[PDB]
Amino acid sequence: SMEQVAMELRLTELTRLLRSVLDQLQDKDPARIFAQPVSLKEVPDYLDHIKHPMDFATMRKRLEAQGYKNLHEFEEDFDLIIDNCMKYNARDTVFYRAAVRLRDQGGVVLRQARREVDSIG
Template sequence: IKELFNNDREEVFKVQLPNMEERRTFFGDLIVNQAAKPPASENSPAWRPLEVLPVAPPPKPRQLTEKEIRQLEEREEDTLRELRIFLRDVTHRLAVDRRFRAFTKPVDPEEVPDYDTVIKQPMDLSSVLSKIDLHQYQTAGDFLEDIDLICSNALQYNPDKDPGDRLIRHRACALKDTAYAIVREEMDEDFEQHCEEIKESRKRRGMYAPSYYHVTPKQNSVPGCKNTDPKCDEKTKMPAAPVDSSTPRSNGKLHFIQTFLEKVLKSMIP
C-alpha cells in the first residue's frame, strides 16, 4: 500500500501521536462539561406531550387572470362543440331509421288525451335535438339519459298486452341499445372523461349556457289579426302532421295502435 503513494508529491500525510495535554483538551469538554449537566426534568418542554394539531387545509387554487379564463372557456367550448356535432349525428341517424319513426316527434295530447296523465316527463328525438342546440348536454351521459327516458316512457305507456304495444316496446328497447352502441363504439373514453371534467369545472365556476340560445315564442304573423282573435289562430296553425309522425291522427290509443300496425304492414310489403 505504501508504494501507491509518493512522498515527493506530498501524497503522504504523517500523523504523530498526541501528547497528554492534547488529549485532555480534546476530551475535556465531553467528560467534564457535558457529562456534568443534570438530565432534563419532566417539566421541561422536551417531556411534555405534543399537542395534536388539526390538519391544515389545502392551499387555495391560484386565481386565474381574465385572459386565462377566456382561454380556458375557449378550449372548453371547442371540446363541447365537438360533442354537440357528434350528438347531432347520432340523433339524426336514429331519427332517419324507420324503426324509430314513432319517437321522432312529441306526442300530441289532442290525439292521445290520456298520455299526459300517464307520462309526466315526455321526451322525443326532436326535443333531444333542441336540447343539443341549447347547449344542455355537456356529456354523452346526459344525452343517453334522455334516450333512456324515451324508452322508459314507451314501456310505461304501452303495456305488454297486445301486438301493437309489444312492437312499440321492442322498438323502444332497440332505440336505446342502438344509441348506446353508437356512443360506446364511436366516442373515445378519454373524450367523455374530459367532458365530465369540463362539466364539474363549469359547475364550480357557475357557468351555464348563454341566455341568447333560448328562442322567444313567435308572434302572430297574420296581418290585420289580433292575438285574441280565434280566427287568426286557425290561420296560423300548422298543417296536420303526416301519418309518419310519432302520433298519427286519431282520437284515442286504440286508433293510434291500429294505424301504427297498418304502417308497419305497408313497410313490409315490397
C-alpha cells in the same frame, strides 16, 4: 378568457359527436314512432301517466342549443324515450316493440360513443 374559449370548443365538438349519435339512433326508428312529442290533443291523459315526456325532436332542440354538457345527459334523454313508451304501452303493441328494437340497436351505437367521448376527451 382563453380557457372559456377552449371549453366552448370542447362543447362544440361534443355537440358535433352527439349530432351524429342522434342521427344514428333515429335511423333505428324507421317508423318514426319517436320522432315527435306524444300529442296531448290525441292522448289527452298522457301527462297523468308519464311525468317527463321525451322524443327525438325535443332532443334535437336541446342539442342545437348545446344543451348537453356530457354523454350521460344525452343518454338520460334517450332512455326516457324508451322507458316512457314501455310503461305507457303494453307489451303486445307496435309501440312497445318499436322501443325494444330501438333500445337493442341503439345500445351498440352508444357503446362506441362512450369510448369516443372518453378517447377524444
